[PDB]
Ligand binder design. Structure first.
Ligand SMILES: [Mg+2]
Ligand SMILES: [Mg+2]
Ligand SMILES: [Mg+2]
Ligand SMILES: [Mg+2]
Ligand SMILES: [Mg+2]
Ligand SMILES: [Mg+2]
Ligand SMILES: [Mg+2]
Ligand SMILES: [Mg+2]
Ligand SMILES: [Mg+2]
Ligand SMILES: [Mg+2]
Ligand SMILES: [Mg+2]
Ligand SMILES: [Mg+2]
Ligand SMILES: [Mg+2]
Ligand SMILES: [Mg+2]
Ligand SMILES: [Mg+2]
Ligand SMILES: [Mg+2]
Ligand SMILES: [Mg+2]
Ligand SMILES: [Mg+2]
Ligand SMILES: [Mg+2]
Ligand SMILES: [Mg+2]
Lengths: 114, 82, 127, 206, 151, 101, 98
RNA sequence: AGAACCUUACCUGGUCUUGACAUCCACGGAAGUUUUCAGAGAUGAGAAUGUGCCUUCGGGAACCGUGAGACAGGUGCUGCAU
RNA sequence: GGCCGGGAACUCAAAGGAGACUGCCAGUGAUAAACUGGAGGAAGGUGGGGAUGACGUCAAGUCAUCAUGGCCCUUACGACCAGGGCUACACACGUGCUACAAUGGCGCAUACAAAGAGAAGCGACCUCGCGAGAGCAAGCGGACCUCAUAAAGUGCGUCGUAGUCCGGAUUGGAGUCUGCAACUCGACUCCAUGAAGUCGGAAUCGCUAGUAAUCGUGGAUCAGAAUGCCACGGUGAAUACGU
């Protein structure tokens, strides 16, 4: 219940609880469970510490919370320092992937200023 | 992006220009209009002036600007605020 | 001998043969139950015999195609009625009074230019 | 600007088509542009021969043109020289062997294309539009037509404000589909601009 | 309308109980044309209700309908000048319609676990005169008889 | 509609069907799993971009055959909607009549 | 054996051509199976009728390709020549296979 | 009824001018095909063929390129001239 | 296995016909028009839907489809090219799509459509890839082959009311395909991320039945590129006292 430096919840199925790891989604979660040999429909509380630390060293094969967070931070900082178009978009807080900016882009833009 | 089985993309005029530059000096800004050409590793240290629509923006190529296209460093639109 | 009735409803068409038998109902090589999971569709299919004589008296071999579940159920009821009218024609009035003989010809309206789905108009605005 | 084309709305019912051929989607646009070139050329040539229709047929890699004209002698010329000239200069642009037949319009006064053409020619020669319209209306009604409507639009008489003038006589039932209504238009290019003439001629139902 | 006397819809009876009233209830509860889903919900709810009540599914349903069904309803109208609330008697078909609609709305509120359980709980509360459909009918009957002066 | 642009379309069509079957084989090379993946398939990428741009059929526009209109085109007829309607009402288009159902 | 597929834009014209073909046969020899209707293609088009704007003003046109199949079996080889060398009705496309 | 280029009509820059698109003259001549260099391309320079049912050897249709002028061209304005 | 022989019954196809006319019955009505019911009939009274838009109005829209009077430019307001732009973003509005969930999400299994399109086009099958796709490659100018698994539905589990196994914006990385070319500025896939959003103020819109609602499908345009448009079917309501 303390995998990858975080505290994934019990009383949840294993597929659902593993997704609480930053860097593990549904696909990676079920892959971790299939490598560990654990049924997806079992609760983390219903596991034995051998099952949990096999889960741990199986998640170890993936870049996760701190590692992945700093990886993404370096990607974005690389773009911003390079000064490419995407870097300038990240700087100015505008859409990066060519989306509409005339009317939408509230997610990338924040709420309306005036 | 450009598929892997087709290789990267560069215009031949820019290719020949950067060959001649990497063979014979790193002095002049290579004036190019090919914003669509991928930046190759043999272009590092060059000072390629890429057309942005009305000027040629000088781009000093680094090894970090490799997987990219020349246009990403010549912003075409001007915006200072509202 | 073998009394036929076509039946059609809402893009669906049935072919219903009936014989004097002991309660067989087969639709596209499947029983009524393993073909119509819908209780309402099975009720519809059985209505025209529930109305007159269904205990065992007839064996129904039905081939239906086109349309959806309810369309096929209605086409089947129509075909059963049309076949029962070819076997003791005197049941025609008893059927007519409950319906089952009207074709039920209400089709899907065509989509119309400027409209969304043939009546839905697109969100008029004053200004 | 709210009425259906009479010919177009009656194309299935009473009026026939002007091009009679089957093509697949491959050569459909090619046949269509070739018919356009053919009709354009024939109209520009026989502009002085009172041509009313150019029916087009494509029987098996041939081009059969049928010129409904009021001056068959003028379109044929003598010796057939004119029709052979036209057959050659039609086969050239159609890319296939040509065959030009001629159908004489017995009553050019009962032909919406010929009536409109006469009216526009008068308007170019600066005849007064009311005179032209009334003349055409009376001509058709006396040559025998259950109705005729003539309509001219534009800077009539060189006026600075354009207006529409129309004269009806008899019956012109436009909403009746079985009605045999020959409708056609033309445009006069006067020194003041375009004046549009459109003529409806009713010739009974069924 | 303005011109026509409206001929009325022919509704098939309920396939499980032959009750056109229950079919109308299924229709009131149906969304998006999902009649299978609607009838599944109402059948589960009537099973649960018949269990909690002992009596028949239809009988408990009718008891709830009686307890939520209105007799008089106010109508914003006028003979002239100002539109006040005029209490008008409710004809029986509109009585059934309003009862079923208020029950379905009350059951769509008061989230319990699912629609079947919510509908069963609302029908039980109605049969014992304590749901919010009953309170809907009560406040309707109080709006009327507060506007009893008008008629 | 800009005789110059109609001429551009003519030029592009002629150039495309001229340089066809050469652009085609260069693209076949570039798409081939074989051809050394480093020399032939790389020089083809350069030959293709040295070919005239107007030889690429993706640069033709499908204007109306009569008015040269770039929008509202119909491939079955080769005309924009306006000329299609005119010819269809005049009866020029065989078998084409007003549809109702 | 021989399949003659006729397609026209007018059903009256295609029926005249079909009668023409099936009575070009039955004179040179027997054994023609008869015309099969074949679903008509209804190709619809929906164009804007205004020169500018007015989006919702449209004309809907359609071409109806009518299709017949004659299916002449076991030719007399006095019939193959009679069926070819014909391009009648000038508006009916004929495809003769086998 | 579908702006990456094209579309495209706009901008910057590089260019051309009887012209990208027609007809008319005279001059030299096949049309095409391959290819080199420079150029962002437009384009400007350079290299073998090729000799058609009209050759009555005169000339000729086709397709060029070049000169000069009629002109061509304009998605320039006016929908309040049509 | 309609797979074959075979049958031409049935569905269906598409040509030609019949059928609906207040034709019949009763009542009301001025002895009229008509109205109200009823019979039969598949259908009932303009059966449903469409096309069809009178004289005119707005000097409405369109000189940028086209044509056109006039005016204007004609070494330029004409023409060619490359790159950029039309995709800009403090904001405001219109029309939509997707959501806020349990009448649901997810997983497994399994039913029922219609209407279309297809030749530098649609492209099975098989193989490879998690996938988008790729390779090879039949068939098909088509009731034959392909697009092309309809989905909602149904059955069985799970989730158990949480901003959640809801939501899927955004962003990072890895790709595929089209195309000379995917930076500005494509679509799609995979992995990761898990935003606002708890049903929406004053207001306001559509709809009277197979309509609304909801579910999927196709087509034009089109190299690629729709939540738009045009079309198709599935399920399928509520309500109309009345003015
Ligand atoms: Mg996670
Ligand atoms: Mg709209
Ligand atoms: Mg629908
Ligand atoms: Mg294009
Ligand atoms: Mg043009
Ligand atoms: Mg087809
Ligand atoms: Mg310039
Ligand atoms: Mg105006
Ligand atoms: Mg006007
Ligand atoms: Mg105005
Ligand atoms: Mg204006
Ligand atoms: Mg200019
Ligand atoms: Mg350009
Ligand atoms: Mg651009
Ligand atoms: Mg725009
Ligand atoms: Mg989710
Ligand atoms: Mg979450
Ligand atoms: Mg929040
Ligand atoms: Mg209405
Ligand atoms: Mg109701």
């Amino acid at each position: 219940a303390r995998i990858a430096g975080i505290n994934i919840p019990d009383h949840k199925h294993a597929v659902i609880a593993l997704t609480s790891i930053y860097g593990v989604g549904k696909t990676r979660s079920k892959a971790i469970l299939a490598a560990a040999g654990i049924a997806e429909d079992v609760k983390i509380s219903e596991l034995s510490e051998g099952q949990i630390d096999t889960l741990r060293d199986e998640v170890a094969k993936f870049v996760v919370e701190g590692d992945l967070r700093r990886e993404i931070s370096m990607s974005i900082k690389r773009l911003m320092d390079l000064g490419c178009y995407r870097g300038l978009r990240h700087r100015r807080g505008l859409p990066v992937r060519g989306q509409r900016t005339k009317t939408n882009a509230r997610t990338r833009k924040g709420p309306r200023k005036p | 992006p450009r598929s892997l089985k087709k290789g990267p993309f560069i215009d031949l005029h820019l290719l020949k220009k950067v060959e001649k530059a990497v063979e014979s000096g790193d002095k002049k800004p290579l004036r190019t209009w090919s914003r669509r050409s991928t930046i190759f590793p043999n272009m590092i240290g060059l000072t390629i002036a890429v057309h942005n629509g009305r000027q040629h923006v000088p781009v000093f190529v680094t090894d970090e600007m490799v997987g990219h296209k020349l246009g990403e460093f010549a912003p075409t639109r001007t915006y200072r605020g509202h | 001998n073998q009394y036929y009735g076509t039946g059609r409803r809402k893009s669906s068409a049935a072919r219903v043969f009936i014989k004097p038998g002991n309660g067989k109902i087969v639709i596209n090589q499947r029983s009524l139950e393993q073909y119509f999971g819908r209780e309402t569709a099975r009720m519809v299919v059985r209505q025209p015999l529930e109305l007159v004589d269904m205990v065992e008296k007839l064996d129904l071999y039905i081939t239906v195609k086109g349309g959806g579940i309810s369309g096929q159920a209605g086409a089947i009821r129509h075909g059963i009625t049309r076949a029962l009218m070819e076997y003791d024609e005197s049941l025609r009035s008893e059927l007519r009074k409950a319906g089952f003989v009207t074709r039920d010809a209400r089709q899907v309206e065509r989509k119309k230019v400027g409209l969304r789905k043939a009546r839905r108009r697109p969100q008029f605005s004053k200004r | 600007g709210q009425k259906v084309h009479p010919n177009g709305i009656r194309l299935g019912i009473v009026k026939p088509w002007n091009s009679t051929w089957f093509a697949n989607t491959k050569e459909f646009a090619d046949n269509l542009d070739s018919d356009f070139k053919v009709r354009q050329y024939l109209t520009k040539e026989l502009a002085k021969a009172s041509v009313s229709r150019i029916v087009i047929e494509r029987p098996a890699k041939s081009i059969r043109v049928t010129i409904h004209t009021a001056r068959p002698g003028i379109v044929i010329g003598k010796k057939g020289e004119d029709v052979e000239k036209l057959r050659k200069v039609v086969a050239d642009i159609a890319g296939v062997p040509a065959q030009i037949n001629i159908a004489e319009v017995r009553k050019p006064e009962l032909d919406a294309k010929l009536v409109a053409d006469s009216i526009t020619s008068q308007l170019e020669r600066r005849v007064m539009f009311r005179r032209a319209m009334k003349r055409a209306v009376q001509n058709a009604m006396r040559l025998g037509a259950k109705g005729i409507k003539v309509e001219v639009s534009g800077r009539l008489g060189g006026a600075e404000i354009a207006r529409t003038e129309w004269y009806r006589e008899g019956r012109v039932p436009l909403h009746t589909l079985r009605a045999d209504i020959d409708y056609n238009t033309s445009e006069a290019h006067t020194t003041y601009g375009v004046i549009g003439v459109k003529v409806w001629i009713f010739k009974g139902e069924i | 309308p303005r011109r026509r006397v409206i001929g009325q819809r022919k509704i098939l009876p309920d396939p499980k109980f032959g009750s056109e009233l229950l079919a109308k209830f299924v229709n009131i509860l149906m969304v998006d044309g999902k009649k299978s889903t609607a009838e599944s919900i109402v059948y589960s709810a009537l099973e649960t209700l018949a269990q909690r009540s002992g009596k028949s599914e239809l009988e408990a349903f009718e008891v709830a309908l009686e307890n939520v069904r209105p007799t008089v309803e106010v109508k914003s109208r006028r003979v002239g000048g100002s539109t006040y609330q005029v209490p008008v008697e409710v004809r029986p078909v509109r009585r059934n319609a309003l009862a079923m609609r208020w029950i379905v709305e009350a059951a769509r509120k008061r989230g319990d676990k699912s629609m079947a359980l919510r509908l069963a709980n609302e029908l039980s509360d109605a049969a014992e005169n304590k749901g919010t459909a009953v309170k809907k009918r009560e406040d309707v009957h109080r709006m009327a008889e507060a506007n009893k002066a008008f008629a | 509609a800009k005789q110059s642009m109609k001429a551009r379309e003519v030029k592009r069509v002629a150039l495309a069907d001229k340089y066809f079957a050469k652009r085609a084989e260069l693209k076949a090379i570039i798409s081939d799993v074989n051809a050394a993946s480093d020399e032939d398939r790389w020089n083809a990428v350069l030959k293709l971009q040295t070919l005239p741009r107007d030889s690429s059929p993706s640069r033709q526009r499908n204007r109306c055959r009569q008015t040269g209109r770039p929008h509202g085109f119909l491939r079955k007829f080769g005309l924009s909607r306006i000329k299609v309607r005119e010819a269809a009402m005049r009866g020029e288009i065989p078998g084409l009549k007003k549809a109702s159902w | 054996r021989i399949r003659i597929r006729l397609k026209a834009f007018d059903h009256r014209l295609i029926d005249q051509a079909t009668a023409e073909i099936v009575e070009t046969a039955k004179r040179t020899g027997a054994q023609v199976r008869g015309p099969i209707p074949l679903p008509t293609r209804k190709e619809r088009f929906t164009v804007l009728i205004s020169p500018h704007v007015n989006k919702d003003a449209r004309d809907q046109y359609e071409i109806r390709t009518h299709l017949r199949l004659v299916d002449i079996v076991e030719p007399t080889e006095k019939t193959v020549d009679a069926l070819m060398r014909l391009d009648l009705a000038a508006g009916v496309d004929v495809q003769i296979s086998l």
